[PDB]
Design a protein around this ligand. Structure first.
Ligand SMILES: CC(=O)Nc1nc2ccc(-c3nn(Cc4cc5ccccc5nc4N4CCN(C)CC4)c4ncnc(N)c34)cc2s1
Length: 822
């Protein structure tokens, strides 16, 4: 039983648990038993949750950031239903109280014992909120549709829960012996080394003597470092680069100078190096696992006797404003002297003080830390900055995590991609970020879901495979049931991979109709119908994927041959008609990031009362160049529509009418007006988002429209101006915005306003994007690695300007776009 589970975990995470044992590594072992313990208690806590509290755990509320409506309501075990008319202002309780009246009359004769499930989804309506505040009711209003709900009794929710149970002495300089290696090249080889605390060096780098390429290299030399051993900060990182010269880089490697138990390191180490793209401070501090083939350096840390880092108990014993909103060396010195008044009267400037503190002198670090221990808790915004690699100290990190606990679950979810990436910066396996993510994920099943997937999707990256593998193991121990739910997902993804391979093979040797019918036969096999059916969507756990409609599935006959998979569900009706796209061969990470950023804009816009009718569709990497994109139904590409085919509702006398004609046929009579407004709002949002993000090569192939008028972007797949990208107005959208008239300055200028509001609201949260992109640097995305990428956002949001200033600047950009539009 505990052997079945171990095997289930092994299959789910894509790494066998026996591989953890074989490392005979006490840090891995200690991480495992402690994190198992932590996760088991969390699971125990959850099995006694109240029924409302469980709903909160398993089906967290989906909310928006007088008027009448129709609702259909039924009860759990009957098909008979009642249609009521209520107010968009009424709470779920009144509707429930209403539904119980109708039952008592029909069956010839307490609302608070129920919750309302959205039919055929894992989504529930409860709490003291007006119906219009629930994403679902809210969404229903905009599309016309009647909300459909089931009354579920508390006794039934509890049955769900139950079924789901489980020191300063050493004054001599620091130094190492560089012994030998075993490697491949073409000329002479040099080892260069630096001591780092984040990006900042703790002293100058020191180089090797030249030795010939023939090697199996030999050195037997002492590299001495210009810094007292008693000064090495807790998080001292020692870094190596091996290269050749008569410059040609070969490999690099890093390690911490203290182990995970705070002990200084001795004596001999063998470092298995990673291939190079010279010093790489940000690289992992674990050696290359491919030890058969990896070049290796042998070194020797010299025993100065054990020696540990001193307990905090010991450590605790031991024109300003005009600048405070990069600084000269005299400005630095001023801040440091003011550290106390910084604490008392500028607590939000912590980050700036941390960057001036001298991490290569131990006495100053004791100073800074002592101030940190009484430092007031900081705003989330400020805390997200502190998580950056320019703050490696474990005390700083703990303060940051401590400031971050006041994150709501909706916020945490919004920034989960970045917090996971920042695991790649960590020095050690057991850390505060890991416990934090595990804890919040075990308290919220939606967080759990995406945490799992963000980690699972990277298991083929050797630098994170062990770390990420271990976290998912701990997660599973805390939720046996959710483990199985995710296995169902992994098995579906495994079959889709097999199905996509067949399509790639078949389609090269036969015509599209022929392969299509083959795909269907392949899907109609028992093993497939079953593996592909009855799962939660990896794109959204509240979306249930029930019956694959084989007949509606296809593939696109191009490059990587992505698959199109439709689902239906009687229980959910029209709402359970949903689709996924499976893509294998392409990397989806950049698109996911882009889409999260756009969805962030939408939330920020909505919090100022601006709704730009965005389309934040699912996009999720699940494996090695593998993931999923959510089908947005009732949509088509601008290119396709602009083919202006005859025999169609939308056939134009002039190609420029095509897109308007299409909208007309989808939205007759008085419906046309709202579709044009939907188009205008959505167009403004994507124009501003693409501009702020530096995304170009937009064209009719990678823009789409919904039948409601909503325009949205797909397949980005470059950003931050690396292809300065101009603002873009396509004449074809301008034509539609203008209701089909040559001149319509009343409509075009309401459009300009939309853009100007959207843009000015983002500037107010400019720092949030900057902090978020800074952390994303951890992802290893080629287009998001250096500072010229961050600078791109600095320039697009004109953060160093006044709002009047930037708004004029933006107005020049917009007018330039208008001229470019024919
Ligand atoms: C790296 C990368 O590819 N990123 C990508 N991101 C996206 C995002 C969206 C889409 C996408 N593309 N399309 C058009 C489309 C894509 C198909 C993909 C695989 C198989 C069949 C496909 N058919 C598509 N159409 C074209 C329009 N037609 C009316 C319906 C079917 C979408 N339709 C609805 N929802 C979507 N989300 C899409 C594709 C991609 S690819």
């Amino acid at each position: 039983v505990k052997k079945l589970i171990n095997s289930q975990i092994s299959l789910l995470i894509g790494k066998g648990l026996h591989e953890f044992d074989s490392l005979r590594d006490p840090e891995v072992n200690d991480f495992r038993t402690k994190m198992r313990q932590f996760c088991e208690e969390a699971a125990a806590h959850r099995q006694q949750l109240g029924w409302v509290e469980w709903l909160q755990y398993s089906f967290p509320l989906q909310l928006e950031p007088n008027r009448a409506l129709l609702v259909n309501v039924k009860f759990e075990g009957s098909e008979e239903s009642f249609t009521f008319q209520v107010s968009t202002k009424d709470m779920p309780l009144a509707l429930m109280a209403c539904a119980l009246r109708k039952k008592a009359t029909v069956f010839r004769q307490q609302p608070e014992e129920y919750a309302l499930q959205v039919n055929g989804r894992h989504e529930y309506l409860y709490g003291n909120y007006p119906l219009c505040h629930f994403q679902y009711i809210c969404s229903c209003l905009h599309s016309g549709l009647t909300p459909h709900l089931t009354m579920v009794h508390s006794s039934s929710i509890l049955a769900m829960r139950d079924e789901q149970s489980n020191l300063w002495s050493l004054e001599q300089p620091f130094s190492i012996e560089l012994i030998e290696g075993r490697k491949v090249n073409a000329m002479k080889l040099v080892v260069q080394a630096g001591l780092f605390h984040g990006n900042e060096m703790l002293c100058k780098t020191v180089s090797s003597s030249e030795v010939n390429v023939c090697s199996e290299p030999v050195w037997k030399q002492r590299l001495e470092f210009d810094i007292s051993v008693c000064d090495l900060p807790r998080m001292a990182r020692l870094c190596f680069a091996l290269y050749a010269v008569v410059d040609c880089p070969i490999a690099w490697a890093n390690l911490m100078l203290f182990d995970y138990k705070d002990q200084l390191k001795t004596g001999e180490r063998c470092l298995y190096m990673w291939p190079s793209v010279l010093l790489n401070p940000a690289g992992t501090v674990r050696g290359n696992p491919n030890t058969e083939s990896a070049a290796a350096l042998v070194i020797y840390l010299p025993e100065v006797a054990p020696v540990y880092f001193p307990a905090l108990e010991k450590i605790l014993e031991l024109l300003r404003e005009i600048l405070e909103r990069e600084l000269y060396e005299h400005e630095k010195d001023l801040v440091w002297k003011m550290r106390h008044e910084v604490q008392e009267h500028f607590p939000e400037a912590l980050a700036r003080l941390l960057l001036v503190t001298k991490w290569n002198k131990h006495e100053d670090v004791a100073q800074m830390l002592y101030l940190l221990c009484s430092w007031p808790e900081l705003p989330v915004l400020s805390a997200l900055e502190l998580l950056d690699f320019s703050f490696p100290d474990c005390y700083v990190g703990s303060f940051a995590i401590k400031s971050l606990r006041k994150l709501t679950d909706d916020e945490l979810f919004q920034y989960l991609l970045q917090l996971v990436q920042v695991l790649k910066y960590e020095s050690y396996l057991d850390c505060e970020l890991t416990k934090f993510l595990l804890g919040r994920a075990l308290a919220n099943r939606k967080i759990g879901h995406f945490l799992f997937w963000h980690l699972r999707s990277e298991m083929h990256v050797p630098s994170v495979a062990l770390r990420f593998g271990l976290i998912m193991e701990a997660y599973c121990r805390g939720s046996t049931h959710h483990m199985k739910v995710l296995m169902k997902q992994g098995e579906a993804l495994s079959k889709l991979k097999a199905l996509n391979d067949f399509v790639k093979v078949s389609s090269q040797k036969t015509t599209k109709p022929q392969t299509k019918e083959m795909m269907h036969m392949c899907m109609r096999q028992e093993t497939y119908m079953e593996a592909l059916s009855h799962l939660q969507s990896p794109l959204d756990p509240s979306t249930l994927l029930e019956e694959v409609c084989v007949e509606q599935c296809t593939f696109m006959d191009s490059k990587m041959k992505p698959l199109w998979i439709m689902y239906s569900s009687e229980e959910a009706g029209s709402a359970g008609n949903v689709g996924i796209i499976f893509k294998n061969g392409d990397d989806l990470r950049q698109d996911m990031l882009t889409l999260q950023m756009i969805q962030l804009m939408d939330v920020l816009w909505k919090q100022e009362g601006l709704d730009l009718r965005m389309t934040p569709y699912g996009c999720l990497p699940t494996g090695d160049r593998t993931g999923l994109i959510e089908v947005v139904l009732h949509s088509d590409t601008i290119a396709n529509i602009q083919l202006n085919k005859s025999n169609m509702a939308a056939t134009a006398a002039f190609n420029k009418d095509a897109l308007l004609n299409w909208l007309k046929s989808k939205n007759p009579g008085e419906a046309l007006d709202r579709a044009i407004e939907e188009f205008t709002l959505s167009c403004a949002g994507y124009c501003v988002a693409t501009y702020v993000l530096g995304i170009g090569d937009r064209h009719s192939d990678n823009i789409m429209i919904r039948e409601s008028g909503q325009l949205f972007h797909i397949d980005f797949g470059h950003f931050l101006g690396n292809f300065r990208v101009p603002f873009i107005l396509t004449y074809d959208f301008v034509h539609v915005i203008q209701q089909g008239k040559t001149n319509n300055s009343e409509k075009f200028e309401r459009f300009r306003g939309y853009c100007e509001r959207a843009y000015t609201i983002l500037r107010r949260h400019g720092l949030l994007f900057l902090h978020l992109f800074a952390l994303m640097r951890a992802a290893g995305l080629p287009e998001l690695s250096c500072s010229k990428d961050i600078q791109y956002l600095k320039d697009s949001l004109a953060l160093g300007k006044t709002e009047e200033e930037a708004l004029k600047h933006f107005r020049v950009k917009f007018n330039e776009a208008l001229r470019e539009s024919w």
